[PDB]
Amino acid sequence: NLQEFLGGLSPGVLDRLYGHPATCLAVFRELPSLAKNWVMRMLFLEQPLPQAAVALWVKKEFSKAQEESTGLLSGLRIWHTQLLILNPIFRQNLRIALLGGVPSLDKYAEERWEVVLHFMVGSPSAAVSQDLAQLLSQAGLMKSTEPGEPPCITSAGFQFLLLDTPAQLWYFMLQYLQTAQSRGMDLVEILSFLFQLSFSDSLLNFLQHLREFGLVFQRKRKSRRYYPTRLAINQPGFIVVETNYRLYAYTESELQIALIALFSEMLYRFPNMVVAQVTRESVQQAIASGITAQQIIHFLRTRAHPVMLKQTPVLPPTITDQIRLWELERDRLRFTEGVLYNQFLSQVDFELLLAHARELGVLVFENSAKRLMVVTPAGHSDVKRFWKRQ
Amino acid sequence: RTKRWEGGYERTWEILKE
Amino acid sequence: TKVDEYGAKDYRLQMPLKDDHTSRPLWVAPDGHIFLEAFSPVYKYAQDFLVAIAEPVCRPTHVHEYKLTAYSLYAAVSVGLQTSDITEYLRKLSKTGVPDGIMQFIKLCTVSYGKVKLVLKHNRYFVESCHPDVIQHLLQDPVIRECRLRQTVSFEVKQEMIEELQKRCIHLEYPLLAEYDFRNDSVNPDINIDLKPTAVLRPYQEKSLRKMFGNGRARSGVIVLPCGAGKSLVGVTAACTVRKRCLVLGNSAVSVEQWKAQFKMWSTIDDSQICRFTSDAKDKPIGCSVAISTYSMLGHTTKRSWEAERVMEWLKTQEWGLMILDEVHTIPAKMFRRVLTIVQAHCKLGLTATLVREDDKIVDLNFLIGPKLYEANWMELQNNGYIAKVQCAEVWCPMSPEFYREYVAIKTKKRILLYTMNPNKFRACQFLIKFHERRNDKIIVFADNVFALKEYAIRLNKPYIYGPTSQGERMQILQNFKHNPKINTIFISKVGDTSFDLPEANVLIQISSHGGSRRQEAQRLGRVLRAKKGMVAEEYNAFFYSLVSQDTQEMAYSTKRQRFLVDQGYSFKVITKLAGMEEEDLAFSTKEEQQQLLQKVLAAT
Amino acid sequence: NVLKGVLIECDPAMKQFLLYLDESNALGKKFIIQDIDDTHVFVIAELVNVLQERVGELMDQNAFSL
């Protein structure tokens, strides 16, 4: 989440990131419940106050909210104890932020994201962009290993594909920022633009990438002014599930049919409908590719036709249980690398080695009755060194 | 004295017209 | 014909889409498959029309699946639906048009009907036809000449070769008409049989009877209805409506007894007018007309006792207005099917509840008797309350380690006796029976292996029944099960699924299965479908458990066996583990007991 | 002593199947180095892929092809 992203930052980058225009407001909106109230209170104070007052300024009931808010805002470093006055820079910027100082766009965003997903999947016809391809490859969801041949899709790629559009896009942009730092693009400058959206060379390239993703559209031959789409700021279902593992999806966009075929066997394709079967072959194929039953169940639930919404649960228990059992059977045999021991002359030495392995985290499994254990190869060197040291 | 079945098929859909 | 990048066939360039597709709830695939919506406001009308012109293959709660064939279209024409009368409404209902392939198929199937009619008179089967060109171009192959005994053109045909000629015509594209004009028939006087007002006909029963009597002439066909739905009542009503000599064919002594009881209960016909052409007992079969007999006797191939020979000659000589055949799924058998040609009947109605089998001989029924007239909707009956709602479940029992070791080690087929008898399934069935016994639910345990059945029954000191069990002891055990409160469970063998009149049971556990037999599965499931006096559909009072052993051939057999039930719509819920099993004390709680059971299994040989 | 390889944990039925495999030399070798517990065994790392393939074939046997 954005809270995680901002928490994973240093004070030096934090205070700089607290730009005047928007950041002080975007980070404010993050404040879940109560820290908003304290920020407004001590927005006008130039004198720090004791911590005991903040501690006792919440009733005995629901105190956990007080501690969690205080910890979150301490991590954000909005104030300093100074002994709890807010940062002067943040105070000034917030005062300046507080009385101081479309139908075609959404369709465009939808179409651009749909073509991006088409390229992500093995679609023969898709938008071509070397920068987009390499960006997705380095995002960790795609690997090519051969420039001549089109890149394939890694295990994480299918999991990313089956995610919902909001979370999918949010994770994609998170990876974009993480790779932006690696490629050398300043993180603060690009990050501030995202906050400003919800209200230089690097800026131009970043806006080009955002437009390629479909969040923004200049509409004027790449002019300075931009009109963000709905997705920039941050629908009914169509699948009907039977009790015989049969899916009838009212899909016209090829993306939905491809997503369903990823874990189901297609039987018929009507102009406004498609029939597929969820069989062991397809489900285990998806599981081997890397998906887990949770993603499939969530995908079918979110794309649930209104007809089956009346019944509770929406997805039939037999279908859900069958999918879960199919995924479990694949991982019945759990493989874990390790090194076995044999010929323990005395159990005292074995117990001492067990205690050492437990302390170091090396041990994976132990058997007192048989006087043996298993250690991962990483800890094999450590235990071997201990044995040599005697 | 015949039965209702001997009369003929109900043709339940024939009521609906478009 | 066109295949997309995926498995599904492509029809983007095949047929168009109607603008008012949302209004139209019907789909039409080129292969003949039709997908109806159970949520549309016109669902009832669409269901009636699609049932009239097509036979269901899958009817889940949301989207029903039908497929039409030549036999279904012939049945539609028999009930009087013309090619236009069906195709115009099909196009109107269809939300994506009608492919030219289906159009031409419907036209050809409808036009190729009624040209050739088969009528039996004075013990002679004449192939009548108003059009003479049909016969002129039908006498090309020599089989017709050799078969034939050595406007409105008709010729006599040999009795024995009727089946061969009929199956030949089916692929010759000239189906024969078996309609019986009982209304206009003076050769055989009508029998004094009437339907008393006491009998009550349910709406689905009336609909099936109407489809059979689409017109004044009765149609010969197969009506599939659940055993608890009153198929016996439907057959009795059909005979009463026919008002002519009726020959009912059971499959066993219990079947013939039940048929006689149903006749007496629901028909005003006197007792003396009904006979039981049965070896165990007879009631002067030649004396009266309405008869109940058995396939085994009528098709008996070996020596015939003199009295039975006289009766058989009388039956062959006489002509029957109606030939009722219960449990038609066994008809395509050699001896059983020989009975069709042995006996003469205008219309041979067929009744059953599990019209499914592995060998592709079910298709032969379409010509042996006729097209499948009606097939009751099990889900709709459940909703209406005519049939008790069933919570179908499959209890997965993990196989014990040693048992699995021997099972996998041996490549022979002792596994049938091995995996059917494992400690985990034994404990599971014991715990389930205990839970239902304390819940006052009647239990009917099933097991194909008599050895396993006997072992389980002795270990649980319960009254197991099986083939060579004495009839008196069988009746005593059934009476005790029905009446004595102290006992609420009976362990029946395969004989149970064949034919019986057993009391309604709240649960039905199946520890073992004969194999991938949809027939057996449906037959055993039908036992608990008996609706209670005041139950409710949503209460799920009835339960069916099909215990299976994990990681064994039993899983494959169960999955292949539940196909018919899932097609009807029943959802088999999987149960990996049962709550309270660990706390409850059960047999085989120690390694030693499993060891002795394994040793006994190995010594079984 | 110290033995290289991998440890695999599974249900007792699969453990017994692996014991049958090693005893009958289905793969040609006694890959089971030792039996850690009723549900845990040790196998050589190199053979694990084909052992998993054999287990998949067993699942194919015990599952109907819908």
Distance from CA of A220 to the nearest CA of D (A): 55
What does the alpha-carbon distance between residue B17 and residue C601 come to, in Å, rounded to a whole number? 68
Contacts of C310 (CB under 8 A, 6+ apart): C286
What does the alpha-carbon distance between residue C402 and residue D38 come to, in Å, rounded to a whole number? 11
Q: Three-class SS of residue A216?
A: strand
What does the alpha-carbon distance between residue C261 and residue B15 come to, in Å, rounded to a whole number? 41
What would you measure as the largest C-alpha separation in chain C, in angstroms? 85
3-class SS string, C49-69:
HHHHHCEEEECCCCEEEEECC
Q: Which residues partner with A37 through β-bridges?
A: none
Q: Three-class SS of residue C575?
A: strand
What does the alpha-carbon distance between residue C25 and residue C40 come to, in Å, rounded to a whole number? 6
Chain Cα centroid distance, residue C31: 26
What does the alpha-carbon distance between residue A112 and residue A105 come to, in Å, rounded to a whole number? 11
Closest C-alpha to A325, from D49, C512, C396, C545: C396
What does the alpha-carbon distance between residue C278 and residue A40 come to, in Å, rounded to a whole number? 98
Which residue in chain D is spatially nearest to C551 when comparing CA positions? Answer: D62
Gapped junctions in chain B, after residues (C–N > 2.5 Å): none
Q: Which residues of C have a CB under 8 Å from any CB of B?
A: 42, 44-46, 48-49, 52, 79-81, 89, 92, 183, 206-207, 209-216, 241
β pairing state of C372-375 and C222-224: parallel
What does the alpha-carbon distance between residue A389 and residue A332 come to, in Å, rounded to a whole number? 39
Partner-chain residue, chosen from D2, D14, D45, that has the shortest CB–CB distance to A341: D2
Q: Which residues partner with C249 through β-bridges?
A: C293, C325
Report the first-to-last Cα separation within chain C, whole angstroms.
53
What does the alpha-carbon distance between residue C413 and residue A290 come to, in Å, rounded to a whole number? 37
Count Cβ neighbours within 10 Å for each residue of C355-375 and write b for 16 or more, e otherwise.
Answer: bbeeeeebebbbbbbbbbbbb
CB C36 within 8 A of CB C49: no
What would you measure as the largest C-alpha separation in chain D, in angstroms? 49
Residue C305 marked ligand-binding: no
What does the alpha-carbon distance between residue A276 and residue A257 come to, in Å, rounded to a whole number? 9
What does the alpha-carbon distance between residue C250 and residue C256 come to, in Å, rounded to a whole number? 5
CB C196 within 8 A of CB C267: yes
Q: Do residue C552 and residue D12 have CB atoms under 8 angstroms apart?
A: no
CB C269 within 8 A of CB C194: yes
Q: Three-class SS of residue C401?
A: helix
Torsion of CA C440, C446, C450, C454, to 10 degrees: -20
Which amino acid is residue C295, in one-letter code?
A: Y
What does the alpha-carbon distance between residue A207 and residue A195 come to, in Å, rounded to a whole number? 14
CB A315 within 8 A of CB A301: yes
Chain D partners (3+ C-beta pairs within 8 A): A, C
Which amino acid is residue A299, in one-letter code?
A: F
Q: Do residue C206 and residue B4 have CB atoms under 8 angstroms apart?
A: yes
> Please, what sign has the CA dihedral across residues C136, C139, C145, C148?
negative
What does the alpha-carbon distance between residue A192 and residue C125 come to, in Å, rounded to a whole number? 94
CB A283 within 8 A of CB A326: yes
Q: Quickly tell me which residue has 């064949």 as its tokens.
A: C498
Gapped junctions in chain A, after residues (C–N > 2.5 Å): 83, 101, 199, 234
Closest C-alpha to C441, from C519, C397, C388, C477: C388
Q: Do residue D16 and residue C559 have CB atoms under 8 angstroms apart?
A: no
Distance from CA of C78 to the nearest CA of B (A): 10
Q: What angle do CA A96, A97, A100 make, to 5 degrees?
A: 40
For C551, the token pair is 């990681």
Cis amide linkage into residue C30, ω under 30° from 0: no
- Where are any strands of DSSP class E within A152-306? 152-153, 216-217, 227-228, 239-241, 246-249, 265-270, 273-277
A345 touches chain D (CB under 8 A): no
In sequence order, which ranges of C343-470 are alpha helices (DSSP H)? Answer: 365-368, 378-384, 401-409, 415-419, 423-438, 450-459
> Please, what sign has the CA dihedral across residues A72, A74, A76, A79?
positive
Q: Do residue C62 and residue A242 have CB atoms under 8 angstroms apart?
A: yes
Method: cryo-EM
User: Using CB atoms within 10 A of its CB, is residue A343 exposed (0-12), middle (13-18) or buried (19+)?
Assistant: exposed
For A126, the token pair is 């898709």
What does the alpha-carbon distance between residue C87 and residue B10 come to, in Å, rounded to a whole number? 18
Chain Cα centroid distance, residue C235: 14
Count Cβ neighbours within 10 Å for each residue of C459-482 and write b for 16 or more, e otherwise.
Answer: ebebbbbbeeeeeeebeebbeebe
A243 touches chain C (CB under 8 A): yes
Q: Which helix (H) or strand (E) holds C573?
A: strand C573-575
Q: Do residue C210 and residue B15 have CB atoms under 8 angstroms apart?
A: no
Residue C225 marked ligand-binding: yes
Closest C-alpha to A181, from A55, A10, A382, A368: A10
* Domain of residue D7, CATH code: 3.30.70.1220
D15 touches chain C (CB under 8 A): yes
Report the first-to-last Cα separation within chain D, whole angstroms.
49
Q: Which residues partner with C352 through β-bridges?
A: C224
Closest C-alpha to C238, from C226, C223, C227, C254: C223
Closest C-alpha to A370, from A352, A349, A344, A339: A344
- Chain D residues with CB inside 8 Å of A335's CB? 6-8, 48, 52
Q: Three-class SS of residue C307?
A: helix
What does the alpha-carbon distance between residue A145 and residue A143 come to, in Å, rounded to a whole number? 6
Distance from CA of D13 to the nearest CA of A (A): 11
CA distances from A353 to A345, A367, D3 (A): 13, 13, 16
- Chain B residues with CB inside 8 Å of C49's CB? 12-13
Which residue in chain A is spatially nearest to D49 when comparing CA positions? Answer: A335
Residue C227 marked ligand-binding: yes
CB A212 within 8 A of CB A129: yes
Give backbone dihedrals phi and psi of A152, rounded to 5 degrees, phi first.
-90, -170
Q: Which helix (H) or strand (E) holds C479?
A: helix C471-483
Chain Cα centroid distance, residue A351: 42
CB A125 within 8 A of CB A258: no
What does the alpha-carbon distance between residue C181 and residue C193 come to, in Å, rounded to a whole number? 18
User: Using CB atoms within 10 A of its CB, is residue A236 exposed (0-12), middle (13-18) or buried (19+)?
Assistant: exposed
CB C83 within 8 A of CB C110: yes
CB pairs under 8 A between C and D: 43
Chain Cα centroid distance, residue C12: 39
What does the alpha-carbon distance between residue C79 and residue C113 come to, in Å, rounded to a whole number? 12
Residue C276: how many other CB atoms lie within 10 Å:
21
Partner-chain residue, chosen from B6, B16, B18, that has the shortest CB–CB distance to C213: B6
3-class SS string, C154-192:
CCEECCCCHHHHHHHHHHHCCCEECCECCCCCCCCCCCC
Task: Choose from B4, B13, B14, B18 for mutation: most chain C CBs within 10 A.
Answer: B13
- Chain C residues with CB inside 8 Å of B16's CB? 42, 45
Q: Three-class SS of residue C371?
A: coil
**D12 is in which domain, residue-wise?**
2-63
CB A301 within 8 A of CB A341: no
Please, how many CA atoms are within 13 Å of residue A149, restricted to the half-sphere of its CB? 8
What would you measure as the largest C-alpha separation in chain A, in angstroms? 82
Q: Do residue C401 and residue D66 have CB atoms under 8 angstroms apart?
A: no
CB A178 within 8 A of CB A78: no
Residue C427 marked ligand-binding: no
Chain Cα centroid distance, residue A120: 17
Chain Cα centroid distance, residue C574: 26
Residues belonging to chain C: 605
Distance from CA of A263 to the nearest CA of D (A): 15
What does the alpha-carbon distance between residue A319 and residue A323 come to, in Å, rounded to a whole number? 6
Number of domains in chain D: 1
Residue C279 marked ligand-binding: no
β pairing state of C573-575 and C390-397: parallel
CB C44 within 8 A of CB B12: yes
β pairing state of A339-341 and A372-375: antiparallel
Q: Which helix (H) or strand (E) holds C34?
A: strand C33-37
D22 touches chain C (CB under 8 A): no
Residue C196: how many other CB atoms lie within 10 Å:
11
- Chain A residues with CB inside 8 Å of D11's CB? 332
Which residue in chain B is spatially nearest to C211 when comparing CA positions? Answer: B9
Which residue in chain D is spatially nearest to C560 when comparing CA positions? Answer: D64
Q: Do residue C183 and residue B15 have CB atoms under 8 angstroms apart?
A: no
What does the alpha-carbon distance between residue C378 and residue C388 come to, in Å, rounded to a whole number? 10
What does the alpha-carbon distance between residue A136 and residue A176 come to, in Å, rounded to a whole number? 9
Chain Cα centroid distance, residue A160: 9
Distance from CA of C112 to the nearest CA of B (A): 22
User: Using CB atoms within 10 A of its CB, is residue A228 exposed (0-12), middle (13-18) or buried (19+)?
Assistant: middle
What does the alpha-carbon distance between residue C75 and residue C219 come to, in Å, rounded to a whole number? 9
Edge to edge, the sheet with strand A273-277 lists A239-241, A246-249, A273-277, A265-270, C9-10
Share of chain B residues as helix, strand and coil, in percent rounded to the nearest 5: 45, 0, 55
